[PDB]
Design a protein around this ligand. Sequence first.
Ligand SMILES: C[C@@H](Nc1nc(Cl)nc2c1cnn2C)c1ccc(C(F)(F)F)cc1
Ligand SMILES: [Mg+2]
Ligand SMILES: [Zn+2]
Length: 343
Amino acid sequence: SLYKKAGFYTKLLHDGIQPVAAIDSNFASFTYTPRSLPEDDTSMAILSMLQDMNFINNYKIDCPTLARFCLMVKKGYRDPPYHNWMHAFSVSHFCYLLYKNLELTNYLEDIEIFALFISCMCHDLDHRGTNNSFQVASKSVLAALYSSEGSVMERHHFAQAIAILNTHGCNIFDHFSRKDYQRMLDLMRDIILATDLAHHLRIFKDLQKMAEVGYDRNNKQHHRLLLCLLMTSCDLSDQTKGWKTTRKIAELIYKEFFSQGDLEKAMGNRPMEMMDREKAYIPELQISFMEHIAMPIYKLLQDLFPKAAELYERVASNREHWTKVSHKFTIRGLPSNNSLDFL
Ligand SMILES: C[C@@H](Nc1nc(Cl)nc2c1cnn2C)c1ccc(C(F)(F)F)cc1
Ligand SMILES: [Mg+2]
Ligand SMILES: [Zn+2]
């Protein structure tokens, strides 16, 4: 359960921002797997995405400041199996794919899309590989700061994002007017807080109604709900990739969950069954997560954006693959080598 912080640029500045096609001809497609990209090329890819969406020119973003901001955000992640920089990078890449493939500009303001992308980058900053319940139980400093207000980790992720903006030479919004600077902070707060599953469970019935009635670009509330739905679709986007991606992410997520469970046992507390390596049956848990959480999110995305149908079909297909493969996975927890390659 020990996950370290690596701390407390020229290669990015000299080698100019790259055209996205030079990274991969499939870079702007829903079939691209951003986890395939070498970790050392991810900061360059973030810059390339912001340039391709024209955010650097439209918001007059200072490129050295942007390069420093990206490296600070990258260094802001610990190394648990799942909630690391590669997860934030892949979530950020999905936001870019929604911009490129759906008609985001016809649904949200440019500032809201910029905020969605920056939030994707920051949304799990300094994650400890433990959930909100653990913060409360371990009586952590984060729980002391935020438990009474809800969404402990998510409030921390946003505070970490703010601390980066406040770091000398990293303020990408420095030249913004007081009103626009504040709008960026408010958007980043609401978007990061939307990543708490408990918040998604609370606003579901309303997302279910926005799609039932239809999206209205003039309803300020429709903009807020959409950002919540889009942020959760970026968060769970590993489920929209190929079977091998969902299998590898299940391995990473459960290795992280099982480490929390071992830690709870060491503290003399009984962990949730899904976090207990002696009780959890991964295929059943994954199928339940896809049916209750991931599939309804992509079904809503499909209802609002017709071009998003392929995303929902891929999630449904992956859920079908888990059912069919379950007969070959006869054990609770993970095998001795922590790998699901046998599937
Ligand atoms: C922390 C993460 N939890 C998961 N739990 C399980 Cl059982 N499997 C998972 C994930 C993520 N990917 N997979 C495959 C999470 C859940 C819901 C959301 C939200 F709904 F809000 F979008 C955001 C993150
Ligand atoms: Mg999170
Ligand atoms: Zn996340």
